[PDB]
Design a protein around this nucleic acid. Structure first.
Ligand SMILES: [Mg+2]
Ligand SMILES: [Mg+2]
Ligand SMILES: [Mg+2]
Ligand SMILES: [Mg+2]
Ligand SMILES: [Mg+2]
Ligand SMILES: [Mg+2]
Ligand SMILES: [Mg+2]
Ligand SMILES: [Mg+2]
Ligand SMILES: [Mg+2]
Ligand SMILES: [Mg+2]
Ligand SMILES: [Mg+2]
Ligand SMILES: [Mg+2]
Ligand SMILES: [Mg+2]
Ligand SMILES: [Mg+2]
Ligand SMILES: [Mg+2]
Ligand SMILES: [Mg+2]
Ligand SMILES: [Mg+2]
Ligand SMILES: [Mg+2]
Ligand SMILES: [Mg+2]
Ligand SMILES: [Mg+2]
Ligand SMILES: [Mg+2]
Ligand SMILES: [Mg+2]
Ligand SMILES: [Mg+2]
Lengths: 188, 260, 142, 167, 124
RNA sequence: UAUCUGGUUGAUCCUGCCAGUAGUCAUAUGCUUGUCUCAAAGAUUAAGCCAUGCAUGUCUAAGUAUAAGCAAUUUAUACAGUGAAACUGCGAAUGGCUCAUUAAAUCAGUUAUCGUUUAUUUGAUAGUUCCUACAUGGUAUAACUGUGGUAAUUCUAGAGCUAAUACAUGCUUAAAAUCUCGACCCUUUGGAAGAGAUGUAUUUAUUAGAUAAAAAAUCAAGAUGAUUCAUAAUAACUUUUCGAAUCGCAUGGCCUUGUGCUGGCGAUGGUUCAUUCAAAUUUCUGCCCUAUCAACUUUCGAUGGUAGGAUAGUGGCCUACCAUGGUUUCAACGGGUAACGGGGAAUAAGGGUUCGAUUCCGGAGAGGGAGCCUGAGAAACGGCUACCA
RNA sequence: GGACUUUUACUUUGAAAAAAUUAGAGUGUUCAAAGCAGGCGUAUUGCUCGAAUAUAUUAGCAUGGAAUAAUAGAAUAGGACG
RNA sequence: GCCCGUCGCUAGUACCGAUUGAAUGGCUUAGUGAGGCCUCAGGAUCUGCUUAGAGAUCAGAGCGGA
């Protein structure tokens, strides 16, 4: 199949190589998963030495962590926004690592306002306790809140869907979301 | 070359088995096991070529399938089983006890030991790590992992092993001036107590040894098996106590012991 | 040089987290290390803003194997250089030597400022690129 | 002599790639596939033999078919399939509900009933008790070592705070 | 795939093909001890040419050199053993001279006749 | 083991080559052939072609026996001995054969993995699974019986049976600690019953993993030469990995007399970690002849950077986007080789010269090319698929 | 353990280094090429030496040496020293 | 005495040379493309989960599996 060996591929001097031996199972390579959005479909790739790896195509949900908040909430993945590699992966909404998405926000608003009693944007006993205990804490961020107003959060996949079998990411925060917002209205 | 090689050709077998050129094509391949291929003595090599109990290999199997043999206490029927340094081979009829320990010539000598001394052995700690669930472990040269080690045991140290159960009964740290048994290099078979060590960050520390005649020689840290205290070995050394006589001295002793 | 973030991806050190909720003045929390072998991680590696995952200090790349020396003959390639390693080879017939040489590709951290003719020290690495197996650990000249 | 294969449609023959667990092919080897010639699933003049199974019996007896009846060769082996054949449930203790087949030595007429695997015996109970036993035996032996090392670690600290009290 | 069973050849043949002096000499030696072969002359003269090289090789080495001593003494006591070297002359400087007939005299063809028992080298 | 001799002239001394001489693990052939031991052998040319046969199969007390098999000791009335066939498991990735290719390739010596996979072997390693069969849960086949096709093969069709360590499911266990929730009460400085969650593996974020020499004010509440290492903690994630529905021998305590709670030896499994057999890339230096090969490389990856895809994993391996770089008279690049490389062989003053298809190691291949199934491992050929011959 | 250190060539010793083959010790294969065996007694209950050693270079690694040969240095003094 | 070159006879080796000469061995542009693999779909048949009915396994309906 595909081969990753360097036997081809001229030596650094510029020298074309002849061909010794053949292609080999262990130099092998396989086709991209090129995973898309919605309707989870996963195929088990059998790799070297047993070793299932998971080929994800069509994945609608992912486990996304709020880094600064120390929690991870399973959300929908609404669509792809930016990719540094290939513009087309945005346009087709293909799920990769380093890919910039927009997720859900809704389980993040249902934890945030149950935790802090705050209600982003715009009566029990022990609840009121911790609610007071948590303050000068819930400041959030200028650019984390305003996203909750359109109810979709910028995330960047840190995982490898075509390998692992999951599309997982973190919420673009501080500097990153400051960077990636620039290219977002410097492209739009 | 598409897989593991399951064969061995005579003349590729390591020289220390002392196998003869003719009289068959191949030498036995040692099983994967406690000890590496090049340092080991398979049980057909020992039961036949050394102990001369078995003529063929077919009698080596007639022996090993009746459980007449055991190694480090366990019966161990594999015709190629890779016995190794510090193992104790025990035959319950004939009531014999052997530990595998090096010659001065670098080879494996048949060394008879006490019904009692047989019951323990020495490993050298190859590594000691913090395992899963926080349980630390140490692992010997001979392939034993042992849970919950004494925390002063560090890498390269030897250990006394129970052999009835897995338990470490004792250890000797690696220090300047501790009786040592070289396993490796040409110096294989010597004894002699560790002058001191060269560091060489970047790999390969060097260990200066002086045996009991005040002769000096060096190896790399890899080959240095700590066996005891000056005098004071923890096992029964074979005759010659690894001093390495010159060819001259060896000619003399042999011809000095002469008259019929 | 300059521009920090000028690439299409956000350049960041992996798993190096500054919470935004907790106000700080550095504005970047930075991880580095020491290569060892008596190789001092220079100030420019701990005071810098550069990312370079391939830097032996601020990066992921682990220095092991040979440690070589040679003089810098090409700085063109950004964040990498080529050094001509002169050596003498022995011809047993004529019992003399002859001038042979090799060029070695090596990745120089922007942690260093190198010019052509400055001899350099270099040490072995996991394969970084097609050609480069070595990273620049010291500037030993000019 | 080429057989039909269900699902190929066509009133023709086509060569196909066959694998394990499929019709008109028995592999010789693990993972072996063999390209072979197969006949369509649609009936036509080119057929020598047509396989017919009867769904509904007709208004006249078919002599070789209906007038006769042929036995099933083997009876239930496993415990619960005997109980589902004979309507027992879990009390009924098969053992006597098992088929017996007589066969003759010619003056010595014999009987042979199969065997069972997966049935519940005193043996199988002793083994499950053995297993539950070793599992708790080791885990408590395991805490024994875990504490005993914890002892060795806190009594090494008190030789550390004592050596700190000597100087 | 078995062992090479190693071998070698016991003799050498003279550089100069036709030399009268040597042809007489060889004949005389072959008549004295009663051989059939210049080969049997060749063979021994090969035996010597190797002993003499070894001797010569031990002589360039320092006096009381472990090699010279260990092998020098070993060879000498070997030659004395079969009676090619004299008790008096064994320091290895007489093996460096020695000569061909010294070995010939020691043959069991020659010893059969040399003490009684035969009354010819051809009867031997 | 440091040697020369013959041949140019009338004669001479030189130059100089031809001839003579000896050895060859160097082939052929001619002639001749008694013994002992040893014993190379279709490499050379044609990795050119192939008739026939043989070369890979396998069972322990110990996964599956209703052979309508064979033994009958009558002692197994579930089965038992023996035991074809078949299933299941494991092997066929070793060996053997050959040297076509292959000239920075291979190979040698020396390094690297803080860059990976790894059956088996050896050492360890599992109380956490939800009224629910746990005295143990499903229907689904071979062999077989029988009915058939086709000139033809290790071709098989339709029908009827019946197993499992096959397939597919599916229970379970001590104490404790910590976490969020929180019904109430009550104002403090505040405290709470009781409800749930916490095996292991997978995925991601975040934190712990200290340690050049020292003291104060305020706002908020173990290891390494080196690592993001080992290991552990938090919040989640999962077409949820694993946590024994298996087997053989012995039958014993315990009796508040029952199939009654317990219980001996060891087989095969099982997850991770280590070990061992390996494997795959990799650092440094070293290859023959050749300028009637001087510039080479980036169609279309050339050299680098960023990111991703992929792989077991490093990596222009591959893809986007960006830069214009990389080799060279220290001979690059191209051509050639009757070129596999090394251990080694022959020739013996010394320095050399010539050879190594071939008994050992490394590599390459199975007519040529490419493709992949199985598996721990094959880009396998005494495996398949296709094309060319 | 902290902080820094001009670079090389040569040469010394050492380690790491398959067996076979080479050199070579030992041993009466009857000699010998070979082989790595064998040699000694209640030969009626075993006794025992061996199966060494050298070469193993060019490069890598570790060490002694500072001759010989290169290299660097402080002159618009931004030189050293504190 | 030596000795040169044409010319003459016979034999041999190479050379130039119309044939847009010819062959073997390897790379390759363009065009076409078997096959396996991955992937969008397909659904011969054969089950599942669920729900409602009747008698102590047969009308009818949803959401997924091979
Ligand atoms: Mg879009
Ligand atoms: Mg092979
Ligand atoms: Mg003449
Ligand atoms: Mg000549
Ligand atoms: Mg005879
Ligand atoms: Mg041939
Ligand atoms: Mg049986
Ligand atoms: Mg790149
Ligand atoms: Mg990358
Ligand atoms: Mg060739
Ligand atoms: Mg050659
Ligand atoms: Mg060769
Ligand atoms: Mg050839
Ligand atoms: Mg040969
Ligand atoms: Mg070979
Ligand atoms: Mg192959
Ligand atoms: Mg093939
Ligand atoms: Mg084959
Ligand atoms: Mg064949
Ligand atoms: Mg004799
Ligand atoms: Mg005797
Ligand atoms: Mg003319
Ligand atoms: Mg004429």
């Amino acid at each position: 199949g595909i081969s990753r060996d360097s036997r081809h591929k001229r030596s650094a001097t510029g020298a074309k190589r002849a061909q010794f031996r053949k292609k080999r199972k262990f130099e092998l390579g396989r086709q991209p998963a090129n995973t898309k959005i919605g309707a989870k479909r996963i195929h088990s790739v059998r790799t070297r030495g047993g070793n299932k790896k998971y080929r994800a195509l069509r994945i609608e949900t992912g486990n996304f962590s709020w880094a600064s908040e120390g929690i991870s909430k399973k959300t929908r993945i609404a669509g792809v926004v930016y990719h540094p590699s290939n513009n087309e992966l945005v346009r087709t909404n293909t799920l990769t690592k380093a890919a910039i998405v927009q997720i859900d926000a809704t389980p993040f608003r249902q934890w945030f306002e149950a935790h802090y009693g705050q209600t982003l944007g715009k009566k029990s006993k022990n609840a009121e306790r911790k609610w007071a205990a948590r303050a000068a804490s819930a400041k959030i961020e200028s650019s984390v809140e305003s996203q909750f107003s359109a109810g979709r959060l910028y995330a960047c996949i840190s995982s490898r869907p075509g390998q692992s079998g999951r599309c997982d990411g973190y919420i673009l925060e501080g500097e990153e979301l400051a960077f990636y917002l620039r290219r977002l209205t410097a492209k739009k | 070359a598409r897989g593991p090689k399951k064969h061995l050709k005579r003349l590729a077998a390591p020289h220390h088995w002392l196998l003869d050129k003719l009289s068959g094509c191949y030498a036995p391949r040692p099983s994967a096991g406690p000890h590496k291929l090049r340092e080991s003595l398979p049980l057909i090599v020992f039961l036949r070529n050394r102990l001369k109990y078995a003529l063929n290999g077919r009698e080596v199997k007639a022996i090993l399938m009746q459980r007449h043999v055991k190694v480090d206490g366990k019966v161990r029927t594999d015709t190629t089983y890779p016995a190794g340094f510090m193992d104790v081979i025990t035959l319950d009829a004939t009531n014999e006890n052997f530990r595998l320990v090096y010659d001065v010539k670098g080879r494996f000598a048949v060394h008879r030991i006490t019904d009692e001394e047989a019951s323990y052995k020495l490993g050298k700690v190859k590594k000691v790590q913090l395992g899963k669930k926080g349980v630390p472990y140490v692992v010997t040269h001979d392939g034993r992992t042992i849970r919950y080690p004494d925390p002063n045991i560090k890498v390269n140290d030897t250990v006394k092993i129970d052999l009835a159960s897995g338990k470490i009964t004792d250890f000797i740290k690696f220090d300047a001036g501790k009786l040592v048994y070289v396993t490796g290099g040409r110096n294989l078979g010597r004894i002699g107590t560790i002058v001191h060590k060269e560091r060489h960050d970047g790999g390969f520390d060097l260990v200066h040894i002086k045996d009991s005649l005040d002769n000096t020689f060096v190896t790399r840290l890899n080959n240095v098996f700590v066996i005891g205290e000056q005098g004071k070995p923890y096992i029964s050394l074979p005759k010659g106590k690894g001093i390495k006589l010159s060819i001259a001295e060896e000619r003399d002793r042999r011809r000095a012991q002469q008259g019929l | 040089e300059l521009t920090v973030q000028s690439e299409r991806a956000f350049q960041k050190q992996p798993h190096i987290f500054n919470n935004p909720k907790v106000k700080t003045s550095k504005r970047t929390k930075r991880w580095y290390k020491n290569a060892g072998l008596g190789f001092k991680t220079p100030k420019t590696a701990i005071e810098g803003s550069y990312i370079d995952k391939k830097c032996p200090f601020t990066g992921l790349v682990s220095i092991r194997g040979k440690i070589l020396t040679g003089t810098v003959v090409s700085t063109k390639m950004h964040r990498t250089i080529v050094i001509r390693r002169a050596y003498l080879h022995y011809i047993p017939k004529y019992n003399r030597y002859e001038k042979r040489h090799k060029n070695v590709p090596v990745h120089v951290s922007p942690a260093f400022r190198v010019q052509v003719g400055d001899i350099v020290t270099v040490g072995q690495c996991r394969p970084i690129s097609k050609t480069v197996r070595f990273n620049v650990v010291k500037v030993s000249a000019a | 002599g080429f057989p039909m294969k269900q699902g190929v449609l066509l009133p023709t023959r086509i060569k196909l790639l066959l694998t394990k667990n499929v019709s008109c092919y028995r592999p010789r080897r693990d993972g072996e596939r063999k390209r072979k010639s197969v006949r369509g699933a649609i009936v036509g003049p080119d057929l020598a033999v047509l396989a017919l199974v009867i769904v509904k019996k007709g208004e006249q007896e078919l002599e070789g078919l209906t007038d006769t009846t042929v036995p099933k060769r083997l009876g239930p082996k496993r415990a619960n399939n005997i109980r589902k054949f004979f309507g027992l449930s879990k009390e009924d203790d098969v053992r006597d509900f098992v088929i017996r087949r007589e066969v003759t030595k010619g003056e010595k007429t014999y009987t042979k009933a199969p065997k069972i695997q997966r049935l519940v015996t005193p043996q199988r109970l002793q083994r499950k008790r053995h297993q539950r036993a070793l599992k708790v035996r080791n885990a408590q032996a395991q805490r024994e070592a875990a504490a005993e090392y914890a002892q060795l670690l806190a009594k090494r600290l008190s030789e550390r705070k004592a050596e700190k009290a000597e100087i | 795939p078995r062992a090479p069973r190693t071998y070698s050849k016991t003799y050498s043949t003279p550089k100069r093909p036709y030399e009268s002096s040597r042809l007489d000499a060889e004949l005389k030696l072959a008549g004295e001890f009663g051989l059939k072969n210049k080969k049997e002359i060749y063979r021994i003269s090969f035996q010597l040419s190797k002993i003499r090289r070894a001797a010569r090789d031990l002589l360039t080495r320092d006096e009381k050199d472990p090699k010279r001593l260990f092998e020098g003494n070993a060879l000498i006591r070997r030659l004395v053993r079969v009676g090619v070297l004299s008790e008096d002359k064994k320091k290895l400087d007489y093996v460096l001279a020695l000569k061909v007939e010294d070995f010939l005299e020691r043959r069991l063809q020659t010893q059969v006749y040399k003490l009684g028992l035969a009354k010819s080298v051809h009867h031997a």
